[PDB]
Design an enzyme around this catalytic site. Structure first.
Site, short mmCIF file in Angstrom:
data_model
loop_
_atom_site.label_atom_id
_atom_site.label_comp_id
_atom_site.label_asym_id
_atom_site.label_seq_id
_atom_site.Cartn_x
_atom_site.Cartn_y
_atom_site.Cartn_z
N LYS B 153 153.93 114.82 -66.37
CA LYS B 153 153.84 116.27 -66.53
C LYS B 153 153.24 116.92 -65.29
O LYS B 153 153.77 117.90 -64.76
CB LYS B 153 153.00 116.60 -67.76
CG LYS B 153 153.58 116.13 -69.07
CD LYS B 153 152.68 116.51 -70.22
CE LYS B 153 151.43 115.67 -70.22
NZ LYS B 153 151.72 114.26 -70.56
N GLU B 179 140.95 118.28 -67.71
CA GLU B 179 141.76 117.35 -66.94
C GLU B 179 140.90 116.65 -65.91
O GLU B 179 139.68 116.86 -65.83
CB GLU B 179 142.94 118.07 -66.27
CG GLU B 179 144.09 118.26 -67.22
CD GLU B 179 144.57 116.95 -67.79
OE1 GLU B 179 144.87 116.04 -66.99
OE2 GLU B 179 144.62 116.82 -69.03
N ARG B 180 141.53 115.79 -65.11
CA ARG B 180 140.81 114.99 -64.13
C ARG B 180 140.25 115.87 -63.02
O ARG B 180 140.96 116.70 -62.45
CB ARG B 180 141.73 113.93 -63.55
CG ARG B 180 142.28 112.97 -64.58
CD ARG B 180 143.22 111.96 -63.94
NE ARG B 180 143.82 111.10 -64.95
CZ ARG B 180 144.88 111.44 -65.67
NH1 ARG B 180 145.46 112.61 -65.49
NH2 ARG B 180 145.36 110.59 -66.56
#
Ligand SMILES: Nc1ncnc2c1ncn2[C@@H]1O[C@H](COP(=O)(O)OP(=O)(O)O)[C@@H](O)[C@H]1O
Ligand SMILES: [Mg+2]
Lengths: 72, 463, 116, 174
Positions: B153, B179-180
């Site tokens: 994605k 998220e990261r």
């Protein structure tokens, strides 16, 4: 007369041992024990996620700070 | 006046005020001794409110005094937030100094009314073969990238930014929601290595933070975008605004974590009973109105590779073009892993894309569907039990599946081959020929990781 | 005092109330006065109440029945006298060959051997 | 929720007091106990985990001083066993409501924009007697927030003639 009634109560019951000397804010008393989870009563200054040390040298992690009891 | 804390259960504090000075539903409270900021959620009555924490709750006692601000969370907006990294509360975290704006806007706001609903269909060519052929985009419409864990994605989103935002003449907003942090740093340094850092505003409440931060973070990200949309410069028109969100699923996940603590019965699987409403309230502010247009790209996680799960199944109704990634295709080596049979769009009709493009897309989908149906017989029995037409369809379908592969401009780090940008006309011409049978003499290995149809012939000749 | 009384019976789950100073440890074994029935402590519900599992049939037990404690987990006989015998969970002969001739007992709940 | 759990204790207390002809003593005792349990220090000293219910009953007896009896001691002992001591104020409120209802006496509150003199209060008292009660306990309250008019609150029934007319006209305008 409600506040005077409160004062009358404060007179009849003298000081109540100073509430056992404020019940020593950094103190507690184990109430429930089950499956490695305990509930403590009266740790007024228990900060979330701190180390609580019991009488035998063990240690605990406070998880829930409820209104009247402290989970661990 | 001021209240005090009486319970702390994970991320859900609750405070007791006087009977007269209780705050409103979404007011903001500040703990006196620390920097923790609380947002009221419920109002339990008898001068007690139940809030959630916008920070870490370690080392908080019971009885700390709390003061109120009598106003919701307010974030800065304007041009001073361009090229800056910001957190939930709109405080700069790039250490470039305080923001030079005075404008403020609450992050809780009602959606635009039905009267001010401008919907347009102006095609947008992204230069990706499968996206252009099967699920075309529309300038001003909402897009989603459904997919499992690790099927690509984020890479697809960073590809769409490269093909559009660089050539885009207009502002942008990137809002990372759980998220990261490494990905955020990489994106910041990629934008700063180029010179397009002055066209983006970034908001990062990432995956290492308490659920309070991950919950009310997308709201700030699109609060900035709403101001960018509804703005007019004198002797000038509205500015086209892009909006990229990463894993909007984390927004509902962070609401699930604090559901039971707020005292609610769990819903079907484990979700909160207010899943659909709390997703709609957010998703209805992203549309484009009579003044300004917001093009939105959203990656949507799919738990346990299950498109039936309540959150991905609830998100489908809020999007115009839905791009569904598949783990089988990715494991087969085909990149991008877009599933050609689940990708749809409202823009794929003869009156918008033309007769020829629509016919080509429908023929491709029909061929792929018939191959998918034949795949079971050729497993038990042999390939030689089928008629000649079915064998021809199988070969053409394998060639079609290969031909959707493409080397991206941003994926050359993983593989090494340079990226390609295929115009729509080349895709249509290639697929028309491939369906007409002109390329029945080309081995199927020549359709893999190539651009237009000329590269296929060149690679076949090289073999 | 160690003695307490039964206050609740639900199938095989029996509650016992001790005075608040003498609540017994978890996994302690209790003996019901007047009968032969051993209860094992499972959890402490506070206010002197203890919830126990009964080892045997509970029919014929009524509330307000005095219960005495042993201040130790279930103890079983060990040694060379146990060779060739059949025993239930509590360590009693069910082979109808007389009492076990040994004297050494051990608790059945003990810590696993350490790393060292 | 709290009011729901106080129905049986309040009804039993009122029935016993009425049958023994000592409603006033129970009313005084219940008000004193509600005030005591409302206190913070006394409640903290009361909920100590070492105390048996008998200890709590004895503590209540000491703080109450006189006006205690076997009836009140038994009532407190029964409450303590089920750990319902915390909800004494609701019991007191319910008991007062039942006693007022049995005497055919209803309470009213008259809120105005100006302080009232004797004749207006007596006139309103006479007017409210057409509700056919024994008496009205009028507690007048001044409100400068209002402009003019008097609002009377009897239980859940309210009669309004004040500035609420302005809001009622505003809604009809818009
Ligand atoms: N377009 C692509 N072509 C080939 N390999 C890819 C492509 N995109 C991603 N991959 C690989 O597949 C994985 C995609 O993961 P990534 O895009 O970073 O985020 P996500 O976890 O959301 O899928 C990575 O290991 C990446 O190297
Ligand atoms: Mg991912």
């Amino acid at each position: 007369q409600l506040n005077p009634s409160e004062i009358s109560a404060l007179i009849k019951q003298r000081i109540g041992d100073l509430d056992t000397s404020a019940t020593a804010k950094n103190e507690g008393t184990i109430v429930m024990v089950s499956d490695g989870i305990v509930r403590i009563h009266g740790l007024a200054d228990a900060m979330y996620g701190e180390m609580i040390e019991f009488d035998g040298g063990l240690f605990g992690m406070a998880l829930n700070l409820e209104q009247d009891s402290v989970g661990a | 006046s001021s209240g005090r804390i009486i319970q702390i259960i994970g991320a859900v504090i609750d405070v007791e005020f006087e009977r007269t000075s209780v705050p409103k539903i979404y007011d903001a409270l500040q703990v006196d001794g620390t920097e923790t900021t609380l947002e009221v959620q419920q109002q339990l009555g008898d001068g007690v409110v139940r809030t959630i924490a916008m920070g870490s709750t370690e080392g908080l006692k019971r009885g700390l005094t709390v003061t109120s601000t009598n106003a919701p969370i307010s974030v800065p907006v304007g041009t001073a937030t361009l090229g800056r990294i910001m957190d939930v509360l709109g405080r700069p975290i790039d250490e470039a100094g305080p923001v030079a704006t005075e404008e403020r806007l609450p992050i809780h706001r009602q959606a635009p009314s039905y009267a001010e609903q401008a919907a347009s269909t102006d095609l947008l060519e992204t230069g990706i073969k499968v996206i252009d052929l099967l699920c075309p985009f529309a300038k001003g419409g909402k897009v989603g990238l459904f997919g499992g864990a690790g099927v690509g994605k984020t890479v697809n989103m960073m590809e769409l930014i490269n093909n559009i935002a660089k050539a885009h003449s207009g502002l942008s907003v990137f809002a990372g929601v759980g998220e990261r942090t490494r990905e955020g740093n990489d994106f910041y340094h990629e934008m700063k290595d180029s010179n397009v850092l002055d066209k983006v505003a970034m908001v990062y409440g990432q995956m290492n933070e308490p659920p309070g931060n991950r919950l009310r973070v997308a709201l700030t990200g699109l609060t900035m975008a709403e101001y960018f949309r509804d703005e007019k410069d004198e002797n000038g028109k509205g500015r086209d605004v892009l909006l990229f969100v990463d894993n909007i699923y984390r927004y509902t996940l962070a609401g699930t974590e604090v559901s039971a603590l707020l005292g609610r019965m769990p819903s079907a699987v484990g979700y909160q009973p207010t899943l659909a409403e709390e997703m709609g309230v957010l998703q209805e502010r992203i549309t484009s109105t009579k003044s300004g247009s917001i093009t939105s790209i959203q990656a949507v996680y799919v738990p346990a590779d299950d498109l039936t799960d309540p959150s991905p199944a609830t998100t489908f109704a809020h999007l115009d073009a839905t791009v569904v990634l598949s783990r089988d295709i990715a494991s087969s080596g085909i990149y991008p892993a877009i599933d050609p049979l689940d990708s749809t769009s409202r823009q794929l009709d003869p009156l918008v894309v033309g007769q020829e493009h629509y016919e080509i897309a429908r023929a491709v989908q029909n061929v792929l569907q018939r191959y998918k149906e034949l795949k079971d017989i050729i497993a038990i029995l042999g390939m030689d039990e089928l008629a000649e037409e079915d064998k021809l369809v199988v070969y053409r379908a394998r060639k079609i599946q290969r031909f959707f592969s493409q080397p991206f401009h941003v994926a050359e780090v993983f593989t090494g081959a340079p990226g390609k940008l295929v115009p729509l006309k080349e895709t249509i011409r290639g697929f028309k020929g491939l369906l007409a049978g002109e390329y029945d003499h080309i081995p199927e290995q020549a359709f893999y990781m190539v651009g237009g149809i000329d590269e296929v012939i060149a690679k076949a000749e090289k073999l | 005092m160690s003695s307490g009384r039964i206050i609740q019976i639900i199938g095989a789950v029996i509650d016992v109330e001790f005075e608040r100073t003498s609540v017994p440890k978890i996994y302690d074994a209790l003996q019901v006065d007047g009968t032969e029935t051993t209860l094992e402590v499972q959890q402490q519900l506070g206010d002197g109440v203890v919830r126990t599992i009964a080892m045997g049939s509970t029919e014929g037990l009524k509330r307000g029945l005095t219960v005495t404690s042993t201040n130790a987990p279930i103890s079983v006989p060990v040694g060379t006298a146990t060779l060739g015998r059949i025993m239930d969970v509590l360590g009693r002969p069910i082979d109808e060959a007389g009492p076990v001739a040994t004297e050494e007992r051990l608790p059945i709940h003990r810590q696993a051997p350490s790393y060292a | 929720e709290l009011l729901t759990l106080a129905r049986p204790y309040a009804k039993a207390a009122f029935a016993y007091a009425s049958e023994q002809g000592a409603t006033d003593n129970w009313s005084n005792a219940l008000q004193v106990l509600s005030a005591a349990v409302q206190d913070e220090a006394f409640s903290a000293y009361l909920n100590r985990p070492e105390l048996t219910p008998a200890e709590q009953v004895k503590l209540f007896a000491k703080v109450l001083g006189e006006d205690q009896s076997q009836a009140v001691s038994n009532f407190l002992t029964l409450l303590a066993d089920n750990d319902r001591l915390v909800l004494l104020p609701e019991i007191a409120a319910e008991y007062e409501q039942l006693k007022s209802q049995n005497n055919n006496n209803v309470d009213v509150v008259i809120e105005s924009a100006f302080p009232l003199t004797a004749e207006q209060e007596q006139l309103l008292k006479s007017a409210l007697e057409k509700r056919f009660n024994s008496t009205v306990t009028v507690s007048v309250e001044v409100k400068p927030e209002l402009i003019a008019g008097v609002v009377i609150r009897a239980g859940d029934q309210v009669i309004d003639d004040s500035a609420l007319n302005k809001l009622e006209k505003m809604r009809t305008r818009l």
